[PDB]
Design a protein around this ligand. Structure first.
Ligand SMILES: NC(=O)c1ccc[n+]([C@@H]2O[C@H](COP(=O)([O-])OP(=O)(O)OC[C@H]3O[C@@H](n4cnc5c(N)ncnc54)[C@H](O)[C@@H]3O)[C@@H](O)[C@H]2O)c1
Ligand SMILES: NC(=O)c1ccc[n+]([C@@H]2O[C@H](COP(=O)([O-])OP(=O)(O)OC[C@H]3O[C@@H](n4cnc5c(N)ncnc54)[C@H](O)[C@@H]3O)[C@@H](O)[C@H]2O)c1
Ligand SMILES: NCC[C@H](N)C(=O)O
Ligand SMILES: NCC[C@H](N)C(=O)O
Ligand code: NA
Ligand code: NA
Lengths: 344, 344
């Protein structure tokens, strides 16, 4: 037995061969089915993730996120949030990897990049939620934060809503000026617009900023359209929020993971008894979302390991079909299982 | 920037090139200094490890063990305890891998086997504790459980104590019959002996069994020598213990990691208020330990991530000097840090 390693090249070849649109659709579909299964009590939310805070060069966190399928395998995503990475090192803020372990023996069976996978399932989760809670004829998307996740937020939302334009803001002038180029393939025209104008004019918004703890909101408490749906995606440190309390208190709020959202999502600002049903419940039983497209709604997105397990499965199906990746004997399997030194 | 991967064959080369005694002594030395640094407040205990219980084919657990060296690197060991692995699959009960991430950026920098590393530092930890708490003239080691850990228990303790004799027991006759061959390189004469004889004659004992939850003790509460030191090494599920409560309550008890020992060690049987200074404190000031050499002592060992990070450092230093291992591009670093689709 050896570990199946998908290098960055293998992951790139999956997306090149399959195409960004079709790959994202597959992940949207697998996420939707998986969330409904949880909502039906056929599956269960992943346990709370954990992490280590890191204060230099700016405050960030490094986290571990397990999800078990009993009798089959265990998925562990390890992922760092390091918001100085782009400017200081030319690295993504979000840097991670995803491993699979056999549930029967414990052996490490697969390992792959977590960077692209994270952006895909995070965009996909917003798409699942916005399909349920945004007006089906939504045409104007607002984006606060135009970094890495904003790319897959726009892309995924453009596959489930008839988007015609994106109004976008970033506190970094260079980051918002470059977004149009990064977004061009979607065919959604991009216009830079200040947060107050985004609040007023957007049918759907995604916030996905590296705003520091305590420096929210990134979207002002002002007039919004009556049917606005917000995907609140920014999430890292306890104490980090993006939306103003007044808007949140007027919202129908659905969390992807209620216990996690109360700790790390917008739901930090909310009493636990004001939470709407979680996203999985919306997917299994749409009675909970019926009519909420026409009033203010917020999808409190923190991300959880089941989403990574599902997106990894999409990647491994394509990789197995194309015989991609390499086999590396990493674990030491001694000829004598009771002799750690039988380096066999 | 690619990930440095040490395969099973590179780990074997490290052992063959360094030698078993030298490699064990390097890990003992590194662990003693590291623990003292914790004892002096220059470093900190790793956080609580997390785990997922599995019930098939027999009860086991899969765990994640993170440790942070601020400004340098984060270590994570992922390790399974699957006690049916030897008989059913010819795999070790303990199966795992150790990953290293840059603490500044989050990047995955190194990945290696954790099977041998785990056995090495677990024996080294018992050696550190037993040098502190056993009589310096201890000649008879007892071993309850003669699987994988027993091999490095005997090896490491034979480097710090003048062992003339090892009296060993295992509930599986083939496992106790094979132990002398697995132990031959240590030079210490092995005798099979039932638990009551081991209790009566041993100067030092390590218990390291796969006993099931609630099926202890593995050593009888009977006549023990007055100066007996016990390394309680077996640890996996909540509810698993190896020592008789009456013995534990008479002993001076030091845990490697108090909150983990409270949940998973022999200290499950004790009140929180009844433990001694932890091992790190005894390394910083052996005075607290010298006075316990001539009385009944128990080192409650659960293993914690710092030991894995230290032993990994030893392996990486030896592997670098011999230019071992491969380099794999696993993490996706897009040419544009804000564009997850900029594959390269
Ligand atoms: N919910 C999930 O599942 C999930 C998944 C991945 C990442 N995230 C989180 O999403 C957030 C964004 O991640 P990313 O990879 O896009 O990071 P990124 O660094 O690529 O982009 C963040 C952008 O936000 C901008 N920004 C910072 N403060 C701002 C403010 N007050 N207003 C507007 N813009 C601001 C930065 O200039 C930067 O361009 C992070 O908190 C990350 O941890 C969430
Ligand atoms: N404390 C630490 O740092 C640390 C590190 C590694 C492993 N461990 C733990 O140590 C234990 C042993 O692991 P291993 O790798 O040697 O497993 P292994 O399966 O190689 O050996 C366990 C042995 O114990 C024997 N055994 C089971 N019940 C017994 C009993 N009642 N009396 C005597 N012998 C019995 C089995 O026959 C087997 O030979 C496990 O619980 C493991 O989780 C602890
Ligand atoms: N903090 C960044 C990690 C992100 N929340 C995720 O679910 O992957
Ligand atoms: N629970 C088995 C794992 C072992 N205690 C370790 O520290 O690696
Ligand atoms: Na959030
Ligand atoms: Na123990």
């Amino acid at each position: 037995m050896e570990t199946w390693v998908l290098g960055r090249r293998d992951v790139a070849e999956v997306v090149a061969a399959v195409g960004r649109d079709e790959l994202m659709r597959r992940i949207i579909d697998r996420l939707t089915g998986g969330l409904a299964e949880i909502g039906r009590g056929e599956r269960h939310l992943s346990p709370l993730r954990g992490g280590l805070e890191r204060s230099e060069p700016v405050p960030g966190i490094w986290e571990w996120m397990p999800h078990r399928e009993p009798g089959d395998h265990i998925t562990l995503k390890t992922v760092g949030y390091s918001p100085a990475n782009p400017a200081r090192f030319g690295l993504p803020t979000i840097l991670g990897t995803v491993a699979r372990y056999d549930d029967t023996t414990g052996a490490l069976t697969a390992l792959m990049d977590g960077v692209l996978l994270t952006a895909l399932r995070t965009g996909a989760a917003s798409a699942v939620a916005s399909r349920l809670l945004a007006r089906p004829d939504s045409h104007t998307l607002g984006l606060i934060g135009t970094g890495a996740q904003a790319v897959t937020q726009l892309h995924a939302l453009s596959l489930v809503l008839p988007l015609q334009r994106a109004l976008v803001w970033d506190t970094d002038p260079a980051h918002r000026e470059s977004f149009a180029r990064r977004a061009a393939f979607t065919g959604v025209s991009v216009e830079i617009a200040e947060p107050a104008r985004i609040a007023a004019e957007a049918d759907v918004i995604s916030t996905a900023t590296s705003v520091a703890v305590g420096q929210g909101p990134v979207l002002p408490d002002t007039g919004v359209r009556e049917h606005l749906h917000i995907n609140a995606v920014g999430a890292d440190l306890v104490g980090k929020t993006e939306l103003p309390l007044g808007l949140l208190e007027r919202a129908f709020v659905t969390a992807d993971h209620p216990e996690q959202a109360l700790r790390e999502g917008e739901c930090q600002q909310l009493s636990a008894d004001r939470l709407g049903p979680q996203l999985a419940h919306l997917c299994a039983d749409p009675a909970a979302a019926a009519g909420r497209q026409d009033t203010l709604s917020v999808f409190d997105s923190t991300g959880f390991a089941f989403e990574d397990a599902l997106a990894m499965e999409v990647f491994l199906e394509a990789a197995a079909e194309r015989d991609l990746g390499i086999r590396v004997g990493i674990e030491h399997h001694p000829g004598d299982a009771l002799d750690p030194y039988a380096l066999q």
